[PDB]
Each structure stands twice: as structure tokens, then as C-alpha cells.
Amino acid sequence: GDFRAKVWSMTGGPNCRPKHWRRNTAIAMFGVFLVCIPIAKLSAKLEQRPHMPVRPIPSQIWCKNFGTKDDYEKEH
Amino acid sequence: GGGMETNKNKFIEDWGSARENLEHNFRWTRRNFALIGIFGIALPIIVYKGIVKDFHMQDEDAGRPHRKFL
Amino acid sequence: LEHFCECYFNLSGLILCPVLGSIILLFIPNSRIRLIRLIGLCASLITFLYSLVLWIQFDSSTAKFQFVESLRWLPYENINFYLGIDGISLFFVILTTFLIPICILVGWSGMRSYGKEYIIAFLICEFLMIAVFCMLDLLLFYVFFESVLIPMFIIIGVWGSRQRKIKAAYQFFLYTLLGSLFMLLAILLILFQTGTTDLQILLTTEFSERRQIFLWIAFFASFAVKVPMVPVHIWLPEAHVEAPTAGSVILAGILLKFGTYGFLRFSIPMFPEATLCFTPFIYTLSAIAIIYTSLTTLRQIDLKKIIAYSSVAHMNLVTIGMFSLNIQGIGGSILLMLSHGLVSSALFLCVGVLYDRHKTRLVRYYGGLVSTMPNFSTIFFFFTLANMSLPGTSSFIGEFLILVGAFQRNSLVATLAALGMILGAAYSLWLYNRVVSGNLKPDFLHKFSDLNGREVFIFIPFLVGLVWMGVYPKVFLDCMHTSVSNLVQHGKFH
Amino acid sequence: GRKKGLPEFEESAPDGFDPENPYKDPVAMVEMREHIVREKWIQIEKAKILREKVKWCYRVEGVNHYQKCRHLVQQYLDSTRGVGWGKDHR
Amino acid sequence: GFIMEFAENLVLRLMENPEERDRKAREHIYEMHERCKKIKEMWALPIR
Amino acid sequence: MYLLIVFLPLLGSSVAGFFGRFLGSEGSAIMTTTCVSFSSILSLIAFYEVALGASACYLRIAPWISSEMFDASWGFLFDSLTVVMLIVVTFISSLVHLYSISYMSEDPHSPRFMCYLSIFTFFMLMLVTGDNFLQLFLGWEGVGLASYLLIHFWFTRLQADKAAIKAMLVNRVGDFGLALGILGCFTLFQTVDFSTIFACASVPRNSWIFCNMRLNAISLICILLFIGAVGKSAQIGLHTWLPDAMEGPTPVSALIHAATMVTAGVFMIARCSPLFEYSPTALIVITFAGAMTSFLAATTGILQNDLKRVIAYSTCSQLGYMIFACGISNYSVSVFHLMNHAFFKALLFLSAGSVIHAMSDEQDMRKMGGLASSFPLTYAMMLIGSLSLIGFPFLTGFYSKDVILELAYTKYTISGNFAFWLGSVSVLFTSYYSFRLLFLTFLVPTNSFGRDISRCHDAPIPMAIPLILLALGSLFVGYLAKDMMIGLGTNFWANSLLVLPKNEILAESEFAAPTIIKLIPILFSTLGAFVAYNVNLVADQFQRAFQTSTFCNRLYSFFNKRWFFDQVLNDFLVRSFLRFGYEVSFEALDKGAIEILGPYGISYTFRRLAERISQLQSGFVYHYAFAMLLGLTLFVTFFCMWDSLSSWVDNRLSFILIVSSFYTK
């Protein structure tokens, strides 16, 4: 309104129209992709697939934990 | 106009101060006797008897005598 | 026997730090406000770092006491006193050392009128409370606990907001002293049997079932006042509301923990048979406290009164956990003690932020603050969630572990204790929505300021600690398990 | 200083403890309490290892888990009765 | 060199020797269980 | 890639929440929609890998709560049920984000709204992917929190604040039940891991002491878990929060309280079927509750005047069909119906939102009508959704609803009979209210305001796209997925769902039922449509009764006011607790008796006594001499002349008379 233009918030307050919002949006998208790379690596490392799939699947490209839990007697 | 301090309202402050000084109003009435007898003696006793029985029912479920308490 | 420890960083120096700060501040003119502020802040911060180091050198495999060092009172050496910690007391030392600099920082803006007396009182409190947590002797535990009454009395009486602080301070002092005298009586009865007050020896003496009953009651009379348990809880709302903000922080975050620490440290292991005999009694008292006090909280109209009543329900849940006498119960009781010490302190800090600007505690005056103080609103919401034991926050870990411990012993007590999930949500969300949500009321308040840099910084470590314990409580539980296990087993050999 | 490595303890119960009168050798009493705590943790760690077997047999065997996990389930449930300080005494 | 290996060595140097810590613990008790008799004899001394 | 599915909406919400001031409305709309859409694409790939490929995925990040046997962990489980829920949640969430981009375009606070949508999506994903009870509880509470935040999104509105607080408190009552169930599970099995519990569940037979009663432990655990299900799925006990949750913006109603979160109870029952299958008593309880709920919501919805209200009561009734399907041991059918309801109900909420947007936020159906030609696309979407909901033959809702009704018919038990009757009559009621909505909104001669008609507009593209996709789903998804999910002998679910042989009834329902039984859903639906046409078009005086008869007026009120359930609960329960908090705990006790037999009374008496003792120091030298003489006389009397005394005298009476002297004059 009138006083809200003097109020700082993280989400930007009412009717937020930053002038450089396109470049900022692009920078945010690059940041989310960079953050997603290590998450994807950790997920691929951590995934456990006890059963071979019926047909080839995309996770077989990066995940090497297919058919490893067969000897569950030795689990600890 | 001037200041961040709240502009006091006399009735709101009267309400608050009445809340802070309730002990001066206690009269041993019939309603108060009933409320203290029910909620200050009886209900705690009932809860205690419940907790103890729970242990005794566990005791007899395990083939053991009743555990003495208190 | 000199029990001097090998470690460089030990307990005595951590005791000495705030003492030296206080002596130095005794002699600096009140005109040198900047110097006083900086010296007090730096002493407190150095003590905090020292406690962090003490956490690194801690050995999480032994059931013994660590850094044990000794302290020799007479050349006859009949009476010689020991300090030491374990996995039950370590994090309380850390919490004390962490909270004291927060207290100095909260009063930073008003220090020109607060003077050096404010900082000196808080430093003396720090020294006394660290001592209390580090004592392997009943009699010195007594002496160091009563000593905190003097600076706490001064803190409440001098820097409290209004004249009700008089009555509040009187009641605090008198209730606490009555409890302390009861536990002095217990200490002397023990001494007549054993001829000593050394904790390690008492853990290896056998008390009669009868002598145990009497000694347990005399310990209970101090500790239940300290916790507080109903019906000796009524001093707490008055005292925790009338105190200054930092005074309330120290009262809720540290001083309240002393009764539960006394239960964990002396009553449960020294008198296991009495502990067993009184367990239904403790369960009943705590369950009544949780339900009744939560419902009283619901009908309170003062911000500080709502936050103060909330602490009664939380501490009685802690007592249920610790008297469950298993790993979940005691671990959850300790974790909830630490988490409460963070969360209630942060909530008192939020209310203090509001009171410093507007000088009212009455909920009706506030409202619609989300539109003028969004940063405060967000932080307040986070700590409101933490006070409801929301999963992901630190308090949920302790709460659920205590419910686990209680359920395995008595399903009814766990059922009555889980009602807190419903009642605490109710009052916490009602408070938050009446303060922050809705519309502004410009006839009461029309001028506003969100948090400054100091307030944001003050809140940051509380947020970090809450999230850290909430998502990965393993760092704390790994250092505590051996001590907790030996506490649970003490008195039995199968 | 701590030497590098896992903590070391005596495998055996302390010699000097009398179960009849345990408050007779205080040092032996403390040592026996610590030994019992350590033994109890070894039983907890055994039940946890047996739980990993069940977890994986369920996962690997699918709808055949009832017939394939039967012995592992029996072992795990037997180890869990009187484990740690839960709902069973000794 | 490596940060962590140095940090490993530094933390171990800070810590109590577990053997010695558990041994003074035994001397205190053995000495206190058998030392608890001397003082109680003075309290029984007749005033007359 | 499996971690990306769960954590992408968290990343989007974090950027919209912490940096929305740099992105504004447009950036935050894009950032959040992209992250959820990418999670949806990865979810489709995971459905291909796990369900179609028959390759479950297990991922353990770290321990969460490790205390002796207590083994809560940050662990993720991807089986067939999980990927089915993943597709539903991520697809509907992506569509709702896209819809909101245009629906909230004029709202001042859209970035906060998008951040809340994404955080809800993340908590729902945490819920459906957890491999243990504690991670599931975290998701349960998280979706409760996000629902609360979205219901009172317009924070200045007092109705919204009340609705949000009510939703949180009802959900906490369910969470109480759920937490007690989790505690019982841990106590019985010494674990909270799903795989371990399901592998062990057939063995225990022991009895437990619960509140001074001896009960079967498995049954107790299952009933306690079902209490949390009752909370989250708005079943008979804890149903009243769902209609009031309509206070939130329409996209929240579509995503949260119709498609994903409101079905968490059904999902949890389905996921715990390996445990629930060994509690027949709990299954009977579930059967009864679901049936009662379907009838309750169906009868309440027929007199509502607000569009969103009608569609919310529909959701509640549909959730009842899904709960009794579970209670008669047919979990695959309940999950099939869940997936089917997520298409038609989301189509219906978004179509209603389009109508409300076009009518300047008019929501009362009595001020609508004659709108079919003005909003052709929206009318068609609402038609398709309504026909799919009522179970029109060969549409998406036809393949699950009638199979549930046929299975209920085939359950030859008391609760099976109860469920068959109630679901059958509820079909007629739901057909009536669906066609009443269609007729009042689009087909009757217009009852609206001219200023509303003269400012109308149909859906902008970010709104119409999700409507088209949901219409296609509501036409084809049922037929397309029927054999996969409920086809006779299908292995699609693998080990995710468990039906014991003794409870298998699907063959007998498809083969041993009289042909009539299969047609009653079409016949009741046709009758309800006909009754709706007659009531809302050729009735000019069936409203005089409500103005002239006291009994007919009270019944109109009974049904319009939800059986007076909220009134009775507030009058006898909420007011009771609120009054206790002030009149007993605070005023009779804390500030009453405990103050009088405490600091207030103590201070009073010790003041009066110090007062009396001070007066003995009278200032008269004669009193001081007299006191010394009296003390000397006392000394001689008691300490030497107490030899013979003892014959008449006792020590008890001595000290009694002393004290008694205090109470003189």
C-alpha cells in the first residue's frame, strides 16, 4: 500500500516487480541445477535395486547396485 | 502520534489487572468446594488408581504378584 | 587423594573465566560503557568456546565420570570435593555457557542504564550454574544451587519492568529456599549413615528400603519445587513474567533444569527401590500437570504468561520420561531438557523484542504484525512450531522418545502425556495467530520496526541448534548412551 | 592421551563380585554394572544385525517372504524378547 | 599436512588416558570405603 | 534421480521463499512450476522403472533417531504403491502450479503462495516415500502444517484463521491416534521399519494392557493407526474440518483437500495392509466408518449453496467408498479409486474455480445459471468431471466405484451388508447433488446479477491447459489402468499390497453376482438425475413446506447444517475444555485453593501472628517483670512439680490446650 513500500521481506511483499527479474530468474535456475548435480550423484550412489528390471531402464546407466542384496544372510 | 509505546485502553488494563488479582476473589463457595473436591482430590486419585492397576494387570499377565507402591 | 586430570582444558579454568571477568568489571568506571560491554561479552564468549572444546575431548564409551579433578578444603583431607561431568551433564554446561552471552547481547542497547552490575550479575550466575552442573558432591551441589538465588533475586527485582516484580522476587526466593532447606535435611540424614557426601561413594552404598523412602521424599520436596511439579508451580508464572528478558531466559533455560538434573543425578541411582515405589505417584503428578497447566495456558491473556505456563507442561513431560527408567525415557528427558532450554529462551526473546518497542504484554493490543514485522513474524512462527514439537524440530525428538519410554512401562501414562500434542498445538497456534495474523489496530499501535542486526544475529544460533538437533540428534545421543545406560542399570545386576 | 583405536575392555565379568551380597566389594560392584551394560549393548547390536537380515529377505523375496524369511523372523523375534531395557526384565 | 589427520592426532592428545582415568577411580573408592571409619570415631567421643 | 524427485520441490520452495524479492511474481511462478514439473517427469520415469519394470528402489540416507532398538531413519522406499502415489501427487501438483500462475495473477502475494504450494508438495512426497513410520509421521505433520498455512493464506480474514486453526486441531487429534499406534508398533516389534514389521506381523498373538483393559495388541495398534487415518481422510469422527478448509484459494482446495493430502489416510491403510490383514476387528471398524462417512457427506451435500462446499462434501463421500474398500481387504481397488478421484475431483475444483473467477468471485449457485453458452469450455469440463464422478458407464469413475459396490455386495458379513446398503443409497444422493450443481450453475434461467454477466470471461491458457489434461484423464485413465491395478491375478503391485487368501473375493464379485447388482449404480444415478431435474426446474412450491411446517424446516436445517455436528461438538466439548481452563485449573485451583493454602494464606496468617507477637512488647516495664515472674513460675511448676501431676494430667492435653489458646477472642 503506502507503508508497505518501507517494509523489507524475503518474499518481496505485495505486488513485487523487480526490474531485473528475468536475469535473476535465470541465475536462480542455474543455481538450482548446480545444487541438483551433487544430489543426483549421491542418489545414484545410494540407490539399491535388489531386482533386475524386466527391460533395460535409465537407472542402469549410472547406478551399479543391481542384484547385490541376494545374500541377505550376510547383511549387517 | 508520538511513540512506539501502545496507547493504553483503560478497560483493557482493568481487565488485565483483574486477571492478575484473582486470588482476592476466592470465596469458599459451594461451587468452589465441588470443583476442588472433584478436580483437586477425586480425579488425581482416580488417575493414580488407574496407573497402579495398569502395573498390577501387567504383574498378573507375567505371572507375578502385585508390585507394592508408594 | 589428588585426582588431578591430564587434559589441558579442564573444569576449574572454565569455572574461573567469568569470575575473572567479574573481578575486572568491579573496578572499571561506569563512564566506560563500551569497555564494560566488550569485556563482559568477550569473557562469556571465551567461556562458550572453552565448553565447546570440553565437548571435543569427551569420551563417549565410559560409564565413569570424566575430567574428574579434585578440590581440597582442609589440610586434614577428611572433606575433599570433586568436579566431573558425564554424558548427562555435558550438554547442560554447554547450554549454560551458550545462553549467558545471549543474555549480555539482549541488553546491549540498554547497557548505558543497565551498568556493569547487570553484566556482573549474569557472569556470577554463569559461574555458579556451571559449578552446580559440575559437582560430584551432594553438599556442594546444595551450596552452589542456593547461591544462585542472590543474583537471580537481584536480577528480577532491579531490572524487572513493573512493581509486581517485588512480589515475584519474594515468591521465587522463598519457594526455592524452602525446597533447598528440605534437601539440606536430606543431605544431613545421608551424611549420618555414610560419613561422606561424595557422589561416587553414595552410588556404591546400600540404603535400606525404609531409609530410601524418607530420603527420596526429602529429595522430592526440593526437586518438585524446582521442576516445577503441581501444586508448587505457582511461583513460576509470576517470576518468569516479571523478570527482565535475559532474566527470564536464564530462569526458563537453565534454572528450571536443576530439578530434573537433581532427579537424574541423585534420586534415581541412589534410591532405586524408592524410585520404583514412587513411580505411579510421579506419573500421576506429571500427567495432572500436563493436562491442567496446558488448559490454564489456553486461557492466559499475557504473552509472557502463555510462554511461562507452557514450560510447566514441558518439564512434567521430562519427569515422565526420566521416571520411565529406560533408554528412550532418559535419553528423551535429557534431549527435551536441552531443546526446551533453547526453544523457551527463543520464545522469551521474541516476546522481549515486542515488549522493548511497545511496552505491553497484553495480547489484545497486538495483531496484524505480519504486515509490519515479517522477519520477526517468520522467526516467531518457527519457534512456535518448535514449541508444538513439530517433527523436524529438536523438541519432537525428546517428546517422542519420552512417549516411547513411557509406553513400554505404562500405556495409560503415555496416553495422558500424548494429549499434550493436542493442547500445546492449540495454545501455541492461538498465540501466534492473535499476535501476528489479522489486521493492525492503529488506535493501539501505529509505529513499528522489524528486527535490527543484533536481534537477527541473536536468533541465528537458536535456529541452527533447533534444526541441528531436530534432524540429526545422533551427535548428542552418541555422547550420552553410556552414561544413560549405566544410570538405567544402577541398582540391578541382571 | 588416548591411543588411536576402538575402546578396549575386559571380556570377563569382574572377579570379586558376589551376587549374593553385591554391596560388599564396591569396586567390583561398579565394574559388574559396567560389564552388564556392555553385555546388554552386545545383545542390542545382535538383534539389530538380525533385523537387517529380515529387512533384506522381505525386500529380496517379495511375496515369497513368508516362506523364505521364516527362520530369520523367528531368530529376530527371539533376540528381541528380553533385549535392552524395554518391556522384558532379564 | 592433511587437515583431518592433524585434527585426529590433536584430538587424541587432548583426551584423558582411559586406563589411568579408570585406575585413580578405583583408588578413591577403595580408599574411601575403608577410610570412612576414622571420622565417625571422633563424633562418639564422650563430652564428659 | 530418486532423491531429485523428493527434493526438487523443496529447492523451488526455498528459492521462492528466501529470494522471492529478487524474482517477483513471475520469477517465483516459473521457478516453482519448473521444479515441480521436473519432479513430475522424473516421477513418470520412476513409474516406468519400478512398477512397469518390477524393480523396487531402496535408499537410506542416514539415521534420524537411533536410541537402542528405536531405529527411525531418513530412508526412502519406492515400490508400486509409492510410484502410483508419486505420479498422482507430482502430476496434480504441476497442473495446480500452472493453474495458479494465472489464477493468482492479480493477487498481491503470489510468491508466498507458490512457495507454500511447493513446500506442501515436498512434505507429501516425504509422506508417500518413507520407509518407516517416523518419516511417514514427519510427512503427516508437514502436510498438516502446509495445509494450515494455505487455508489462512488471506491472513486478514477471520473466517480463514478459524478454519485453519480448526483443521490443525482436528488433524492433531488424528496425529495423537497415529502416534499412539506407532508407539504400539515399536513396542510389539522393537522397530519402526516398514519391511521388518511387515515380515513379522503374522507371528504375534499376545494380549496387551491398554487403559486397564486386556486387548489384542495387533488389533489395538491397527485401530490406533486408523484413528490418524480418520483424521487425515475426514471420516465420520473427524470430518468437519474439510468443508471449512474451502476458505483457502481454489488451487489449494484442488491440490490439498481433494487429490493428495486428504487421501493420505487411504494410502497409509494400503501401505500397512500387511499389518491390517491380521486384525479382522480393525477391518470391521474401518468398514463401518467408511460407509457411515459416505452416507453422511452425501446427505449433507445435497442442500449446500456454495460450489466449493458441494465439491468438498463430494470428496468426503468418495473418501468413505475408498475406506470401506480397504476395510473389506480390497486395497488395490481403493488405490485405483484414489488415482481415479484425483483426476475428476481436481477437474471439478479447477472448473469451479474458473467459474468463480469468471463471475467476479460469486460462489453461491443461487446467483448463477444460464452460463452454459457464456463459458462453453468450462461447462464441458464440469460435465465431464461430473459424469466421471457419478460413475457414468465406461468413464474413469465407472471402473472403480461399481467394483467397490460389487465387492461390498460380495462381502457376506454384517459390516459388508452395512457398507453395501449405505454405498448404494449414497450413489443416488451423489447423482442428485452433482446434477443439481450442473443445473443451477449452467442450465436454469439465469439468477445472476447483470454486473456479473457483463464482466465474464473464460479461462486464460495457463488455466485451460490443466482442465483439458484432467478431462482427458477423467475420460480414459480408468479403462487404461483397470487390468494393471485390479485385473484378475495381476502382479502389478508385487509385494506392496497384501490380501490373505481367506479374504480374496474379486472372482466371486465378477462372476457370482446377479446381473441386477451390477446395474443398481446406473439406475440410482439415473433416478437422482431425474429427481434433480424435477426439483430444480419443475417445482414451484416444494419450499412452502420449509416455511410452514416446523418438522420440515428443522430437517432442512439438519441437513444444511451438517447434522449439527459442529454445533454439538463446540457446545459440549470445545466449550467444556475452554471453561475448565479458566474456572477450574486457573480460578478454583492455581489462583484459588493453592493460593489460599499457599503464599496468599501463609502471608495473611504470619502477618496477623507477627502483629500479635509485636503487641506483647507493650512498652510497660510491669509486663516485662510479670513475664519474667511467669517464666520463673513455669520453670518451677513444670520441671519440679510434675511428679504427682501425671495422675490427672497427660502431655497430649498439655500441648493441645497451649495451641488452643491461640484461638481466643
Ligand SMILES: CCCCCCCCCCCCCCCCCC(=O)O[C@@H](COC(=O)CCCCCCCCCCCCCCC)COP(=O)(O)OC[C@H](O)CO
Ligand atoms: C501445615 C498444614 C496445613 C494444611 C493442612 C491440610 C488442610 C487442612 C484443612 C485446611 C486448614 C486451613 C483452613 C483455613 C480456613 C480458611 C480461613 C480463612 O478465613 O481464610 C483466610 C486465609 O487464611 C487461610 O486460608 C489460612 C491458610 C492456611 C495455610 C497453612 C497455614 C500455615 C502452614 C505453614 C506454617 C506451619 C507449618 C507446620 C508444619 C507441620 C482468608 O482471609 P480473609 O480475611 O479474606 O477471609 C474472609 C472470610 O473468607 C470471610 O469472608
Ligand SMILES: CCCCCCCCCCCCCCCCCCCC(=O)O[C@H](COC(=O)CCCCCCCCCCCCCC)COP(=O)(O)OCCN
Ligand atoms: C482425601 C483428603 C486429602 C487431603 C485434602 C484436604 C483435607 C480434606 C478436606 C477438608 C475439608 C474440611 C471441611 C470443608 C467443608 C466445610 C465447609 C463449611 C463452610 C465453609 O464454606 O467454610 C469455609 C472453610 O473452608 C475451608 O476451611 C477449606 C477446606 C479445606 C480445603 C482443602 C483443599 C485441599 C487441596 C486441594 C487440591 C490441591 C491440588 C490440586 C491439583 C470458609 O467459608 P467462608 O465463609 O470463609 O467462605 C468465604 C465467604 N466470604
Ligand SMILES: CCCCCCCCCCCCCCCCCCCC(=O)O[C@H](COC(=O)CCCCCCCCCCCCCC)COP(=O)(O)OCCN
Ligand atoms: C502432599 C502435600 C504437600 C505438597 C505441597 C503443597 C505445599 C503447599 C504450598 C506451600 C508453599 C508455600 C511457600 C511459601 C512462600 C510464601 C510467599 C509469600 C511472599 C509474598 O509474595 O508476599 C510477602 C508476604 O510475606 C509475609 O509477610 C509472610 C512471611 C513470608 C512467608 C514465609 C513463610 C513460610 C514458612 C514455611 C511455611 C511452610 C512450612 C513447610 C512445612 C510480601 O507481603 P507484604 O507485601 O505484606 O510485605 C511487604 C512488602 N515488602
Ligand SMILES: COC1=C(OC)C(=O)C(C/C=C(\C)CC/C=C(\C)CC/C=C(/C)CC/C=C(\C)CCC=C(C)C)=C(C)C1=O
Ligand atoms: C490480641 O489479643 C490479646 C492477646 O492475645 C495475644 C492477649 O492474650 C493479650 C496479652 C496477654 C498475654 C499473652 C499474657 C501472657 C504473657 C506471657 C506468657 C509472658 C511471657 C513472655 C512473653 C513475651 C511470651 C514468651 C513466652 C514463651 C514462649 C513461653 C516460655 C518459654 C519456654 C517454652 C521455655 C492481650 C493484651 C490481647 O489483647
